[PDB]
């Protein structure tokens, strides 16, 4: 399986610029590329990526997305003086030309194709191309919005042609609408395009009626274009995450793409003068992380915009950090999306309910500027520690390790004297294991998480939970797959309990989420709907300092456990301890793999979830979203 992250960059692409005064074009400057690469070097991230050389896109490759007439016209700009370059630029909207931009445009496109080849050939797991000029406004026969050729559109067409891919997801988190990409694929059901964008009721550039939520695609492509317009500026981390949990992710995981391309413009970040949004650079670590379980991790990030040189550097680093597998930063202060965003989200979910299973229930009434510098993200020396049953060695990834100090055995003895009587000296070894593993996870930046096999559940959970609380980790999220009651107190806002079980138990209060799904062929899609629509929104708002996972010995969800384990590491900087009750070699090996940062096998498209399950899940949302507003995907009723 593949490893490493490509970083594709060439300082040649910084060698064109604006040659006349035009305050509207003043902001697209060569220093965007230098500052972004220099910031990756400063943080040691460029050095950890495989540098892959830039190349020129060939004429045949340019013609996958552009017309001969347009290519021939752009091919003449190297020979133009400034006057002729000005006259040529003015035939297009918000774009300037330079003697070297044709050269650089061919490099930006070839760079993008280099990234596609490295990922699809399994030479790297994923990667990023830092390119200029950007691509996503570019169209078959026109330059537009600083774009000459459509870098991302190239990549999807090239990947279709040369790797025979049937499903490609393009995520455009730039702050502008990538209409070039929408036009290119509006009739193609094999490319799914998602874009959020500053819109302001069509008053924001490019001022297009078809950037609205009602553009779903055309003909065979209906439902494979998703526009989420932002109708006010100042959108926050909560707005972006609500967009992911309630629009993009439910559709992406159902589409099940074979490759993910990101149109990664960072003008959607705080401080940018074009976007005027308020999302912190750290949010891009999570936008990246949330998409990485797709397509076995095959993800091509390509730079588009971003004009605040400071927030540009930081959001590029957060992105590459996440591509490299580094632990994600904690996101605090999450809440409801604002009313404007909830309206946009509700509107796109409704118009898309004809085409996607996660929105289907909406169709029938029977069912319906300065900001703090980001903290450091040092990867753990050994990411994952594992404690199998005694004397069971197993092939572990190069960054895992097996596990009892004298200090620890004293604590275990102390705890048993006071709270347990018990003398099964094996489940006493379990307690030294749990405590040894927990103390490495928290006291050390050298271990990130771990998994422990245990015999007796109740004493296991108590010591894990209590040792973590009294450590102190302010908040602990507990995710329990099994039935019955555990020694867990949802008494205060220090513990939130997610429980996935098989008996429908009434839910008391807003610090427990109990999911009882009907067992059958639909159990897998239901679990994914709950994960993306219920569990992740609450968990992100809760913001735990540790995640405690618990599986009782009984199989039925061996297919989704790796997706949950990967996604749940967006919380608590990845600090998760999993307790597996009883040895199960497959579940144990699956758990360690996802904890260790490995790629997760695709789910494939699965059987649509049972309506009874969706009913259960929306009753949970109704019950919890007044407390946990990141669960909202409709505007609330005013009094
Ligand atoms: O980053 C971008 N896209 O991803 C981006 C940024 C700025 C602009 C210019 N808009 C103002 C204008 C309209 C006519 S002339 C000047 C276009 C695209
Ligand atoms: K966009
Ligand atoms: K499409
Ligand atoms: Zn932009």
PDB file of N, CA and C in Angstrom, residues 139-214:
ATOM      1  N   UNK A 139     -12.508  28.403 -18.478  1.00  0.00           N
ATOM      2  CA  UNK A 139     -13.569  27.786 -19.260  1.00  0.00           C
ATOM      3  C   UNK A 139     -13.044  27.383 -20.627  1.00  0.00           C
ATOM      4  N   UNK A 140     -13.804  26.508 -21.291  1.00  0.00           N
ATOM      5  CA  UNK A 140     -13.420  25.890 -22.557  1.00  0.00           C
ATOM      6  C   UNK A 140     -12.757  26.871 -23.518  1.00  0.00           C
ATOM      7  N   UNK A 141     -13.282  28.092 -23.605  1.00  0.00           N
ATOM      8  CA  UNK A 141     -12.821  29.069 -24.575  1.00  0.00           C
ATOM      9  C   UNK A 141     -12.581  30.424 -23.930  1.00  0.00           C
ATOM     10  N   UNK A 142     -12.297  30.462 -22.628  1.00  0.00           N
ATOM     11  CA  UNK A 142     -12.068  31.765 -22.024  1.00  0.00           C
ATOM     12  C   UNK A 142     -11.190  31.654 -20.778  1.00  0.00           C
ATOM     13  N   UNK A 143     -10.304  32.643 -20.608  1.00  0.00           N
ATOM     14  CA  UNK A 143      -9.704  32.948 -19.317  1.00  0.00           C
ATOM     15  C   UNK A 143     -10.670  33.780 -18.481  1.00  0.00           C
ATOM     16  N   UNK A 144     -10.558  33.654 -17.160  1.00  0.00           N
ATOM     17  CA  UNK A 144     -11.516  34.280 -16.261  1.00  0.00           C
ATOM     18  C   UNK A 144     -10.945  34.265 -14.849  1.00  0.00           C
ATOM     19  N   UNK A 145     -11.079  35.381 -14.139  1.00  0.00           N
ATOM     20  CA  UNK A 145     -10.721  35.427 -12.731  1.00  0.00           C
ATOM     21  C   UNK A 145      -9.339  34.878 -12.417  1.00  0.00           C
ATOM     22  N   UNK A 146      -8.308  35.456 -13.046  1.00  0.00           N
ATOM     23  CA  UNK A 146      -6.901  35.079 -12.895  1.00  0.00           C
ATOM     24  C   UNK A 146      -6.578  33.669 -13.363  1.00  0.00           C
ATOM     25  N   UNK A 147      -7.550  32.951 -13.922  1.00  0.00           N
ATOM     26  CA  UNK A 147      -7.334  31.589 -14.393  1.00  0.00           C
ATOM     27  C   UNK A 147      -7.148  31.580 -15.903  1.00  0.00           C
ATOM     28  N   UNK A 148      -6.165  30.807 -16.382  1.00  0.00           N
ATOM     29  CA  UNK A 148      -5.908  30.630 -17.821  1.00  0.00           C
ATOM     30  C   UNK A 148      -6.416  29.285 -18.327  1.00  0.00           C
ATOM     31  N   UNK A 149      -6.040  28.187 -17.658  1.00  0.00           N
ATOM     32  CA  UNK A 149      -6.482  26.835 -17.972  1.00  0.00           C
ATOM     33  C   UNK A 149      -7.010  26.177 -16.710  1.00  0.00           C
ATOM     34  N   UNK A 150      -7.929  25.238 -16.878  1.00  0.00           N
ATOM     35  CA  UNK A 150      -8.651  24.732 -15.717  1.00  0.00           C
ATOM     36  C   UNK A 150      -7.902  23.536 -15.154  1.00  0.00           C
ATOM     37  N   UNK A 151      -7.003  23.830 -14.203  1.00  0.00           N
ATOM     38  CA  UNK A 151      -6.107  22.823 -13.637  1.00  0.00           C
ATOM     39  C   UNK A 151      -6.882  21.637 -13.081  1.00  0.00           C
ATOM     40  N   UNK A 152      -7.909  21.901 -12.278  1.00  0.00           N
ATOM     41  CA  UNK A 152      -8.628  20.800 -11.645  1.00  0.00           C
ATOM     42  C   UNK A 152      -9.463  20.038 -12.661  1.00  0.00           C
ATOM     43  N   UNK A 153     -10.104  20.743 -13.586  1.00  0.00           N
ATOM     44  CA  UNK A 153     -10.875  20.044 -14.608  1.00  0.00           C
ATOM     45  C   UNK A 153      -9.978  19.108 -15.411  1.00  0.00           C
ATOM     46  N   UNK A 154      -8.793  19.597 -15.820  1.00  0.00           N
ATOM     47  CA  UNK A 154      -7.761  18.759 -16.442  1.00  0.00           C
ATOM     48  C   UNK A 154      -7.569  17.461 -15.693  1.00  0.00           C
ATOM     49  N   UNK A 155      -7.282  17.584 -14.397  1.00  0.00           N
ATOM     50  CA  UNK A 155      -6.976  16.434 -13.565  1.00  0.00           C
ATOM     51  C   UNK A 155      -8.081  15.388 -13.606  1.00  0.00           C
ATOM     52  N   UNK A 156      -9.353  15.811 -13.515  1.00  0.00           N
ATOM     53  CA  UNK A 156     -10.433  14.817 -13.554  1.00  0.00           C
ATOM     54  C   UNK A 156     -10.571  14.202 -14.946  1.00  0.00           C
ATOM     55  N   UNK A 157     -10.498  15.016 -15.999  1.00  0.00           N
ATOM     56  CA  UNK A 157     -10.580  14.460 -17.353  1.00  0.00           C
ATOM     57  C   UNK A 157      -9.406  13.523 -17.634  1.00  0.00           C
ATOM     58  N   UNK A 158      -8.188  13.953 -17.275  1.00  0.00           N
ATOM     59  CA  UNK A 158      -6.992  13.125 -17.436  1.00  0.00           C
ATOM     60  C   UNK A 158      -7.092  11.824 -16.652  1.00  0.00           C
ATOM     61  N   UNK A 159      -7.611  11.890 -15.425  1.00  0.00           N
ATOM     62  CA  UNK A 159      -7.755  10.681 -14.629  1.00  0.00           C
ATOM     63  C   UNK A 159      -8.836   9.762 -15.183  1.00  0.00           C
ATOM     64  N   UNK A 160      -9.915  10.319 -15.734  1.00  0.00           N
ATOM     65  CA  UNK A 160     -10.903   9.496 -16.423  1.00  0.00           C
ATOM     66  C   UNK A 160     -10.260   8.777 -17.601  1.00  0.00           C
ATOM     67  N   UNK A 161      -9.495   9.514 -18.403  1.00  0.00           N
ATOM     68  CA  UNK A 161      -8.989   8.955 -19.652  1.00  0.00           C
ATOM     69  C   UNK A 161      -7.944   7.875 -19.393  1.00  0.00           C
ATOM     70  N   UNK A 162      -6.983   8.152 -18.518  1.00  0.00           N
ATOM     71  CA  UNK A 162      -5.805   7.307 -18.375  1.00  0.00           C
ATOM     72  C   UNK A 162      -5.909   6.277 -17.272  1.00  0.00           C
ATOM     73  N   UNK A 163      -6.884   6.393 -16.386  1.00  0.00           N
ATOM     74  CA  UNK A 163      -7.054   5.389 -15.361  1.00  0.00           C
ATOM     75  C   UNK A 163      -8.441   4.779 -15.375  1.00  0.00           C
ATOM     76  N   UNK A 164      -9.288   5.174 -16.324  1.00  0.00           N
ATOM     77  CA  UNK A 164     -10.632   4.615 -16.504  1.00  0.00           C
ATOM     78  C   UNK A 164     -11.475   4.717 -15.232  1.00  0.00           C
ATOM     79  N   UNK A 165     -11.281   5.797 -14.482  1.00  0.00           N
ATOM     80  CA  UNK A 165     -12.073   6.031 -13.281  1.00  0.00           C
ATOM     81  C   UNK A 165     -13.521   6.330 -13.651  1.00  0.00           C
ATOM     82  N   UNK A 166     -14.448   5.753 -12.895  1.00  0.00           N
ATOM     83  CA  UNK A 166     -15.861   6.027 -13.106  1.00  0.00           C
ATOM     84  C   UNK A 166     -16.426   7.091 -12.175  1.00  0.00           C
ATOM     85  N   UNK A 167     -15.813   7.343 -11.019  1.00  0.00           N
ATOM     86  CA  UNK A 167     -16.353   8.330 -10.084  1.00  0.00           C
ATOM     87  C   UNK A 167     -15.224   9.162  -9.504  1.00  0.00           C
ATOM     88  N   UNK A 168     -15.282  10.465  -9.735  1.00  0.00           N
ATOM     89  CA  UNK A 168     -14.311  11.415  -9.213  1.00  0.00           C
ATOM     90  C   UNK A 168     -15.075  12.495  -8.453  1.00  0.00           C
ATOM     91  N   UNK A 169     -14.644  12.796  -7.227  1.00  0.00           N
ATOM     92  CA  UNK A 169     -15.203  13.894  -6.451  1.00  0.00           C
ATOM     93  C   UNK A 169     -14.275  15.102  -6.499  1.00  0.00           C
ATOM     94  N   UNK A 170     -14.812  16.255  -6.887  1.00  0.00           N
ATOM     95  CA  UNK A 170     -14.092  17.524  -6.814  1.00  0.00           C
ATOM     96  C   UNK A 170     -14.723  18.363  -5.709  1.00  0.00           C
ATOM     97  N   UNK A 171     -13.923  18.729  -4.708  1.00  0.00           N
ATOM     98  CA  UNK A 171     -14.341  19.592  -3.603  1.00  0.00           C
ATOM     99  C   UNK A 171     -13.654  20.933  -3.800  1.00  0.00           C
ATOM    100  N   UNK A 172     -14.450  21.993  -3.994  1.00  0.00           N
ATOM    101  CA  UNK A 172     -13.953  23.357  -4.244  1.00  0.00           C
ATOM    102  C   UNK A 172     -14.281  24.207  -3.023  1.00  0.00           C
ATOM    103  N   UNK A 173     -13.316  24.312  -2.108  1.00  0.00           N
ATOM    104  CA  UNK A 173     -13.531  25.084  -0.893  1.00  0.00           C
ATOM    105  C   UNK A 173     -12.934  26.470  -0.997  1.00  0.00           C
ATOM    106  N   UNK A 174     -12.516  26.877  -2.201  1.00  0.00           N
ATOM    107  CA  UNK A 174     -12.220  28.279  -2.481  1.00  0.00           C
ATOM    108  C   UNK A 174     -13.458  29.123  -2.157  1.00  0.00           C
ATOM    109  N   UNK A 175     -13.245  30.421  -1.904  1.00  0.00           N
ATOM    110  CA  UNK A 175     -14.370  31.277  -1.543  1.00  0.00           C
ATOM    111  C   UNK A 175     -15.169  31.747  -2.759  1.00  0.00           C
ATOM    112  N   UNK A 176     -14.622  31.630  -3.964  1.00  0.00           N
ATOM    113  CA  UNK A 176     -15.328  31.963  -5.187  1.00  0.00           C
ATOM    114  C   UNK A 176     -15.911  30.704  -5.817  1.00  0.00           C
ATOM    115  N   UNK A 177     -16.976  30.879  -6.609  1.00  0.00           N
ATOM    116  CA  UNK A 177     -17.595  29.741  -7.293  1.00  0.00           C
ATOM    117  C   UNK A 177     -16.734  29.322  -8.472  1.00  0.00           C
ATOM    118  N   UNK A 178     -16.455  28.022  -8.580  1.00  0.00           N
ATOM    119  CA  UNK A 178     -15.650  27.547  -9.694  1.00  0.00           C
ATOM    120  C   UNK A 178     -16.488  27.170 -10.893  1.00  0.00           C
ATOM    121  N   UNK A 179     -17.021  28.178 -11.586  1.00  0.00           N
ATOM    122  CA  UNK A 179     -18.011  27.926 -12.629  1.00  0.00           C
ATOM    123  C   UNK A 179     -17.398  27.202 -13.816  1.00  0.00           C
ATOM    124  N   UNK A 180     -16.102  27.434 -14.083  1.00  0.00           N
ATOM    125  CA  UNK A 180     -15.414  26.641 -15.094  1.00  0.00           C
ATOM    126  C   UNK A 180     -15.556  25.155 -14.854  1.00  0.00           C
ATOM    127  N   UNK A 181     -15.394  24.728 -13.603  1.00  0.00           N
ATOM    128  CA  UNK A 181     -15.534  23.309 -13.293  1.00  0.00           C
ATOM    129  C   UNK A 181     -16.981  22.874 -13.443  1.00  0.00           C
ATOM    130  N   UNK A 182     -17.924  23.717 -13.000  1.00  0.00           N
ATOM    131  CA  UNK A 182     -19.334  23.348 -13.114  1.00  0.00           C
ATOM    132  C   UNK A 182     -19.731  23.178 -14.580  1.00  0.00           C
ATOM    133  N   UNK A 183     -19.351  24.131 -15.438  1.00  0.00           N
ATOM    134  CA  UNK A 183     -19.697  24.014 -16.855  1.00  0.00           C
ATOM    135  C   UNK A 183     -19.092  22.761 -17.458  1.00  0.00           C
ATOM    136  N   UNK A 184     -17.837  22.479 -17.102  1.00  0.00           N
ATOM    137  CA  UNK A 184     -17.117  21.369 -17.707  1.00  0.00           C
ATOM    138  C   UNK A 184     -17.833  20.057 -17.461  1.00  0.00           C
ATOM    139  N   UNK A 185     -18.384  19.874 -16.251  1.00  0.00           N
ATOM    140  CA  UNK A 185     -18.941  18.590 -15.849  1.00  0.00           C
ATOM    141  C   UNK A 185     -20.443  18.613 -15.585  1.00  0.00           C
ATOM    142  N   UNK A 186     -21.163  19.670 -15.976  1.00  0.00           N
ATOM    143  CA  UNK A 186     -22.563  19.770 -15.566  1.00  0.00           C
ATOM    144  C   UNK A 186     -23.428  18.642 -16.106  1.00  0.00           C
ATOM    145  N   UNK A 187     -23.033  17.984 -17.199  1.00  0.00           N
ATOM    146  CA  UNK A 187     -23.787  16.847 -17.711  1.00  0.00           C
ATOM    147  C   UNK A 187     -23.136  15.496 -17.438  1.00  0.00           C
ATOM    148  N   UNK A 188     -22.008  15.466 -16.725  1.00  0.00           N
ATOM    149  CA  UNK A 188     -21.245  14.245 -16.515  1.00  0.00           C
ATOM    150  C   UNK A 188     -21.549  13.646 -15.145  1.00  0.00           C
ATOM    151  N   UNK A 189     -22.221  12.499 -15.063  1.00  0.00           N
ATOM    152  CA  UNK A 189     -22.496  11.899 -13.752  1.00  0.00           C
ATOM    153  C   UNK A 189     -21.307  11.184 -13.137  1.00  0.00           C
ATOM    154  N   UNK A 190     -20.164  11.130 -13.830  1.00  0.00           N
ATOM    155  CA  UNK A 190     -18.984  10.489 -13.273  1.00  0.00           C
ATOM    156  C   UNK A 190     -18.098  11.449 -12.478  1.00  0.00           C
ATOM    157  N   UNK A 191     -18.303  12.761 -12.591  1.00  0.00           N
ATOM    158  CA  UNK A 191     -17.619  13.744 -11.758  1.00  0.00           C
ATOM    159  C   UNK A 191     -18.655  14.432 -10.867  1.00  0.00           C
ATOM    160  N   UNK A 192     -18.497  14.335  -9.549  1.00  0.00           N
ATOM    161  CA  UNK A 192     -19.372  15.037  -8.612  1.00  0.00           C
ATOM    162  C   UNK A 192     -18.663  16.319  -8.187  1.00  0.00           C
ATOM    163  N   UNK A 193     -19.288  17.473  -8.430  1.00  0.00           N
ATOM    164  CA  UNK A 193     -18.698  18.769  -8.072  1.00  0.00           C
ATOM    165  C   UNK A 193     -19.465  19.419  -6.922  1.00  0.00           C
ATOM    166  N   UNK A 194     -18.752  19.726  -5.837  1.00  0.00           N
ATOM    167  CA  UNK A 194     -19.272  20.478  -4.704  1.00  0.00           C
ATOM    168  C   UNK A 194     -18.526  21.797  -4.594  1.00  0.00           C
ATOM    169  N   UNK A 195     -19.266  22.898  -4.452  1.00  0.00           N
ATOM    170  CA  UNK A 195     -18.641  24.201  -4.254  1.00  0.00           C
ATOM    171  C   UNK A 195     -19.419  24.985  -3.212  1.00  0.00           C
ATOM    172  N   UNK A 196     -18.729  25.560  -2.219  1.00  0.00           N
ATOM    173  CA  UNK A 196     -19.365  26.607  -1.419  1.00  0.00           C
ATOM    174  C   UNK A 196     -18.761  27.928  -1.859  1.00  0.00           C
ATOM    175  N   UNK A 197     -19.499  29.029  -1.706  1.00  0.00           N
ATOM    176  CA  UNK A 197     -18.908  30.251  -2.246  1.00  0.00           C
ATOM    177  C   UNK A 197     -19.651  31.461  -1.745  1.00  0.00           C
ATOM    178  N   UNK A 198     -18.908  32.532  -1.502  1.00  0.00           N
ATOM    179  CA  UNK A 198     -19.545  33.811  -1.252  1.00  0.00           C
ATOM    180  C   UNK A 198     -20.408  34.171  -2.454  1.00  0.00           C
ATOM    181  N   UNK A 199     -21.694  34.458  -2.191  1.00  0.00           N
ATOM    182  CA  UNK A 199     -22.711  34.692  -3.222  1.00  0.00           C
ATOM    183  C   UNK A 199     -23.461  36.001  -2.990  1.00  0.00           C
ATOM    184  N   UNK A 200     -23.983  36.173  -1.771  1.00  0.00           N
ATOM    185  CA  UNK A 200     -24.730  37.366  -1.376  1.00  0.00           C
ATOM    186  C   UNK A 200     -25.880  37.650  -2.353  1.00  0.00           C
ATOM    187  N   UNK A 201     -26.694  36.626  -2.585  1.00  0.00           N
ATOM    188  CA  UNK A 201     -27.876  36.755  -3.451  1.00  0.00           C
ATOM    189  C   UNK A 201     -27.483  37.229  -4.848  1.00  0.00           C
ATOM    190  N   UNK A 202     -26.375  36.684  -5.348  1.00  0.00           N
ATOM    191  CA  UNK A 202     -25.849  36.933  -6.685  1.00  0.00           C
ATOM    192  C   UNK A 202     -25.187  38.302  -6.827  1.00  0.00           C
ATOM    193  N   UNK A 203     -25.047  39.073  -5.743  1.00  0.00           N
ATOM    194  CA  UNK A 203     -24.306  40.332  -5.838  1.00  0.00           C
ATOM    195  C   UNK A 203     -22.783  40.173  -5.775  1.00  0.00           C
ATOM    196  N   UNK A 204     -22.252  39.000  -5.439  1.00  0.00           N
ATOM    197  CA  UNK A 204     -20.805  38.833  -5.380  1.00  0.00           C
ATOM    198  C   UNK A 204     -20.278  38.184  -6.655  1.00  0.00           C
ATOM    199  N   UNK A 205     -19.131  38.683  -7.119  1.00  0.00           N
ATOM    200  CA  UNK A 205     -18.474  38.165  -8.312  1.00  0.00           C
ATOM    201  C   UNK A 205     -18.367  36.639  -8.236  1.00  0.00           C
ATOM    202  N   UNK A 206     -18.635  35.910  -9.330  1.00  0.00           N
ATOM    203  CA  UNK A 206     -18.937  36.327 -10.702  1.00  0.00           C
ATOM    204  C   UNK A 206     -20.430  36.662 -11.029  1.00  0.00           C
ATOM    205  N   UNK A 207     -21.308  36.785 -10.033  1.00  0.00           N
ATOM    206  CA  UNK A 207     -22.667  37.298 -10.251  1.00  0.00           C
ATOM    207  C   UNK A 207     -23.479  36.395 -11.179  1.00  0.00           C
ATOM    208  N   UNK A 208     -23.498  35.099 -10.893  1.00  0.00           N
ATOM    209  CA  UNK A 208     -24.096  34.169 -11.841  1.00  0.00           C
ATOM    210  C   UNK A 208     -25.338  33.531 -11.250  1.00  0.00           C
ATOM    211  N   UNK A 209     -26.466  33.540 -11.969  1.00  0.00           N
ATOM    212  CA  UNK A 209     -27.650  32.830 -11.467  1.00  0.00           C
ATOM    213  C   UNK A 209     -27.398  31.360 -11.240  1.00  0.00           C
ATOM    214  N   UNK A 210     -26.546  30.730 -12.052  1.00  0.00           N
ATOM    215  CA  UNK A 210     -26.313  29.293 -11.948  1.00  0.00           C
ATOM    216  C   UNK A 210     -25.279  28.911 -10.877  1.00  0.00           C
ATOM    217  N   UNK A 211     -24.743  29.871 -10.100  1.00  0.00           N
ATOM    218  CA  UNK A 211     -24.014  29.537  -8.869  1.00  0.00           C
ATOM    219  C   UNK A 211     -24.939  29.272  -7.683  1.00  0.00           C
ATOM    220  N   UNK A 212     -26.253  29.304  -7.871  1.00  0.00           N
ATOM    221  CA  UNK A 212     -27.155  29.115  -6.746  1.00  0.00           C
ATOM    222  C   UNK A 212     -27.355  27.627  -6.479  1.00  0.00           C
ATOM    223  N   UNK A 213     -28.025  27.341  -5.357  1.00  0.00           N
ATOM    224  CA  UNK A 213     -28.290  25.965  -4.969  1.00  0.00           C
ATOM    225  C   UNK A 213     -29.167  25.223  -5.967  1.00  0.00           C
ATOM    226  N   UNK A 214     -29.955  25.926  -6.782  1.00  0.00           N
ATOM    227  CA  UNK A 214     -30.852  25.224  -7.693  1.00  0.00           C
ATOM    228  C   UNK A 214     -30.136  24.607  -8.891  1.00  0.00           C
TER     229      UNK A 214
END
